[PDB]
Design a protein around this ligand. Structure first.
Ligand code: HEM
Ligand code: HEM
Ligand code: HEM
Ligand SMILES: [Cu+2]
Ligand SMILES: [Cu+2]
Ligand SMILES: [Cu+2]
Ligand SMILES: [Cu+2]
Ligand SMILES: [Cu+2]
Ligand SMILES: [Cu+2]
Lengths: 455, 455, 455
């Protein structure tokens, strides 16, 4: 016999209510199999992959990941795929929860302005990736065409306080990380599996700061975690806690009490978390340069009473989270726009640089620029800075070592190069520093930095 | 006590019958431990890694992966390794099912024209990789020196309708993907873990089209799946279905009802599949650029009656499978040979281009070149094509965007660049198009494309 | 209720005794929860990452991996982090066994010459990675800032004969593998996940030869295996045996009888091994170029009686282990130092070349240089070598093929290029060969090879 053998659809046809990340539809709360009509529309559109960095995403339902679909094992699903008239490419779908060739792909081929449909029975409970299946498949997936479908067990999942939807992806831009402007897809980086960004939910900061996920001490949180790839395998981890359980796809196996778990490319898991003490818990890909250098950082923020018997310490700060500690980095978006418009002010630069200074510079120089006498020199009221701003550009790009004197005190240490910062970033950071802490003001431009970098 | 403690070998010595991929030897069907004599011969030889692309493989038994070995837990295995006189390198073996230093390596060192032997007891049931263990080990493995040995449990595995043998590997050629000719091994790409091909069973198309695996609706299929590496980890997946179970090596754990499973480099699993509806099921590495851009695609084709209650849709086609939808791409091999011989005809090019057009171009332009009026312009009887074939070369290499007029209708869309196509491929595709659909004929040469690419 | 609910700390405060790799502290052997005081000091210092290759490591307790910490589930841990005054960077810690934001990171921020402390309850049994959490986090981890903490179950782990501590990491030097000198950290390679070295316990050869782990036939060995990353996932494997069991972190799941297991970046496992026959067992990352080309090789050497019924063969040798078969390669360190000092003698070169010849050249030419008549030409008393030492430099760098005559016999084979050998390595190998086996003596310098390579 086939699995999911719960008889013909009964009751009324149900129009599925889909949700945008990071939200999940309500439990189906149903004891009979139904005919479920799913309507999903492909939209190609520019969105911000990072502040001041645009990208042409290809999306299921206007978001990356695409809309979440929730059905019950044994349901008959009538799947309608529309391709918005504004699209340039044809699209289709492969849902991993489908039993049949291509997971739906041949019968869902949809040209711009058209609609397709096919029907399948959801034989297998589990959490499943869906994605586009149109040649060149890797390009479509790299552009954002993936999401999750949950096929519930007949009795439903256990009740929890919160359910969230998080999906990792690797992205391939022609430009480097945080290089501003509209960035094309880069096929060469994609084939080589060399992403410029590794993200949760389609953008840097999508789930940090004021966009964090929330829960309270004592509550349970279920996260449906996908890995759209196209190429990477996530060493998926929660900083500061453990997963009560991890279950992949529709697997019978459930792992309990683990911290780091590998999510295949194209894979998905259901994880459960119990909040014990307050603070920010960081979901990461623990291939650490992804998390800390390419954007693969999301936050679950827990509110409630401290418990000093369990953890005596403090909330996370910019030392660990860097420039994502703060609510947002909107000033960077604004400064980038002003640069494009030819209206960039000193204050635009100052506010962008303030945002970027956090972690990146403050770890050593402090958030107030005071440093630590004899160990980390001050940027506040710094004679050394004021004496030569071109030197300061070179220091950021190329580092500094050896004995120096700053504000009457000797330092003999090492500031590593920070060459991966883009010209605008260096310029804005230095303009912030120059306009703070009784420093002499003025500004550094992106062009100034470009010239120094080329020397 | 040691595992596999079933007493001394009894009965008669057994000469193992080894099989070539994708076939498996019969179940041992035996209730006593035996002395099993295994004879395996290393052969170095050129084979086609892709159409018109030769590679010097180093093989156990003339194939990649090497011959399949099947024994019973508790057997005494007398292992004979021969190195064919034509070999240039020495070789040896490490079988993961051996208990002892090197898995056999020191006692199996075999110079060209020599033979070695050693004896081991198969203490541990499971599916195991074997591979060469000769410095430089990575080179030997990269050249194809890996296979599987099954050590059955004493009672045998459960009966199934079909057993097949599939093994992934990563390959490192000096030339790029689909660049024709005899391709040397590339040590630099290998050290960097940057393969040019990622394959099942040693070649593009080894298990697609007319070389697909087969079964019928209702049947069970067991696949012994290896990952020879040397370097990659497979996000192993079956498009359009689920694995009933997955068991790694000799592990006690068995996962049931999963879709995507990570196979370590050097690892192996036994997977089981039950055929429910007809069509082509695609085994892939779901690190998707491997599957769709480097060759990591194999097919299990299921014949039988459709079941519209389970899946209403169609068989896979070139939109998803690309140029591997068709039975084979023999015309590409023939055209490449003709180029070498200096006898390349227009028709040779046309037939090669026909094969390559599928998916690559047809996804948008259609298999009949009609496109979709106002959305995808026609290649059939195309005034725009005819007006300027050099422009058409540039369009394939570099893409096209902006408003154009084709056959009296305006288009305002984007054709992405296709720069990864090789000169011969562009030339053959365009020659096919020019000689189809009332287009003006003539031909485009590889040299013509080379010149355009260099501009 | 919280896990680890064993009541308030009792008895006396315990000062934890930490161990350096590859050793482990004794079992806690305690039936009550305690207050455990842990004191760990960060030290930045140069050490040898390979012979003659220095690197500035950042360490917890002076070693890579850092000191091992062993506590009991339910303990209250008062964690003190000191940063040695000689440090240039600030540091902190994230222990995966902590419940709380950052795993301790915000409350452990410690400038050079300072100390910090925080308290946590160890709620969860398991083996856990700890690492630095200071921006830029990837740099700190890449420089060696990781280790393991074991949180025992209340009843303790089962008794074994030996417990060892092994931790993989990926490292990023500006220079290539085995290029001599003090090598800076390379941020570009790190972001691209392109390590120059992949190591166990912080150095090539850290656990090979005279630094191998030991046990006897019949004994059980537990290894606490970490993967500090920062970036790689280990296809962790024991050559020549099986793991009796593998348990990740504090997971409920235990896998039994497996050979190859994936350890996530930031992950950790407890593996168990039962020694059955004598010899050297190789722990590797089975992404094979890491193991055999980047240093990811460690040894568990088992002493005791052979059992020919289980394995008839020989101990490992340089064919498989290469230049790590021997007790050590101290001669390479000495020759490199002599080069720096301007005192390099012929004999210094000869002894370094002797060490490097093993495997690298001996696999084909034999340890005595005799080759195999008509198959592999001799280096012993070689007329061809003597006739043209510049040609011999080119042969090592660029390979050799075609018909040649050596000592009166024709060869018609292929010696692959060995271009990844550094100039000093080629020079020392050839000087060894020239000064052995009745060859004419003299020497080849690194500068000689540099010139040939540049041709
Ligand atoms: C972040 C991009 C950042 C800025 C900006 C910055 C500036 C800076 C200047 C201008 C100097 C010169 C001396 C002065 O105090 O005016 C300087 C010197 C040092 N820095 Fe710095 N610095 C930034 C980042 C960092 C980081 C992240 C660290 C710590 C890892 C750091 C440290 C130092 C040190 C030490 C010096 C002195 C070097 C010496 O030769 O002794 N900086 N920095
Ligand atoms: C496959 C290699 C392929 C070929 C060949 C090809 C040819 C081609 C030509 C010659 C034109 C010019 C106009 C004409 O119809 O003669 C052209 C234009 C467009 N193409 Fe194309 N094309 C190939 C592949 C693809 C693929 C895979 C797509 C869809 C993703 C595609 C689409 C288009 C579009 C759109 C245009 C018009 C661009 C515009 O400026 O409006 N082509 N193609
Ligand atoms: C290790 C770095 C190494 C050295 C040194 C080396 C030297 C060497 C020389 C000098 C020759 C010339 C002929 C002679 O015998 O004097 C030579 C030729 C061949 N080699 Fe070699 N060789 C080194 C390594 C290796 C390895 C690892 C192999 C086997 C894979 C190998 C093989 C050969 C072969 C074969 C030849 C002859 C080539 C031919 O044209 O027939 N060498 N080697
Ligand atoms: Cu699409
Ligand atoms: Cu998929
Ligand atoms: Cu070999
Ligand atoms: Cu192996
Ligand atoms: Cu640190
Ligand atoms: Cu961590």
């Amino acid at each position: 016999k086939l699995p999911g053998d719960f008889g013909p659809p009964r009751g009324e046809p149900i129009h599925a209510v889909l949700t945008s990340p990071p939200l999940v539809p309500p439990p189906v709360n149903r004891t009979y199999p139904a005919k479920v009509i799913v309507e999903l529309e492909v939209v190609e559109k520019e969105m911000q992959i990072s502040e001041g960095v645009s990208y042409t995403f290809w999306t299921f339902g206007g978001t990356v990941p695409g809309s979440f679909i929730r059905v019950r094992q044994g349901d008959t699903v009538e799947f309608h795929l529309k391709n918005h008239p504004s699209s340039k490419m044809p699209h289709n779908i492969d849902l991993h929860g489908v039993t049949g060739p291509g997971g739906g792909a041949a019968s869902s081929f949809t040209a711009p302005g058209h609609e397709s449909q096919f029907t399948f029975k959801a034989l297998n409970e589990g959490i499943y990736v869906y994605h586009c299946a149109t040649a060149p498949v890797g390009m479509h997936i790299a552009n954002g065409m993936y999401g999750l479908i949950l096929v519930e067990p007949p009795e439903g999942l256990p009740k929890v306080d919160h359910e969230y939807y998080v999906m990792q992806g690797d992205f391939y831009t022609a430009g480097k990380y945080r290089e501003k402007g509209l960035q094309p897809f880069d096929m060469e980086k994609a084939i080589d599996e060399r992403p410029s960004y590794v993200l949760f939910n389609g953008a840097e900061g999508a789930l940090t700061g004021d966009k964090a996920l929330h829960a309270k001490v004592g509550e349970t949180v279920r996260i449906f975690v996908g890995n759209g790839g196209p190429n990477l395998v996530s060493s998926f981890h929660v900083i500061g806690a453990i997963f009560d359980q991890v279950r992949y796809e529709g697997g019978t196996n459930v792992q309990k009490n683990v911290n780091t778990t590998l999510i295949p490319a194209g894979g998905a898991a259901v994880v459960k978390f119990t909040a014990r003490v307050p603070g920010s818990y960081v979901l990461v890909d623990h291939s650490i340069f992804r998390a800390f250098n390419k954007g693969a950082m999301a936050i679950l923020k827990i509110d409630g009473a401290e418990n000093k018997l369990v953890y005596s310490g403090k909330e996370l700060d910019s030392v660990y989270l860097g420039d994502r500690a703060a609510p947002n980095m909107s000033a960077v978006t604004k400064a980038t726009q002003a640069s494009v418009s030819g209206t960039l002010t000193v204050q635009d630069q100052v506010q962008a640089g303030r945002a970027l200074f956090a972690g990146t510079c403050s770890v050593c120089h402090q958030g107030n620029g005071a440093g630590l006498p004899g160990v980390f020199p001050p940027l506040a009221k710094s004679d050394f800075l004021a004496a030569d701003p071109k030197r300061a550009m070179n220091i950021v790009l190329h580092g500094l070592n050896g004995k120096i004197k700053v504000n009457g005190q000797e330092y003999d240490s090492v500031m590593p190069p920070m060459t991966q910062l883009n010209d605008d970033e260096v310029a804005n950071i230095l303009t912030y520093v120059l306009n703070s802490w009784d420093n002499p003001g003025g500004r550094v431009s992106a062009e100034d930095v470009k010239k120094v970098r080329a020397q």
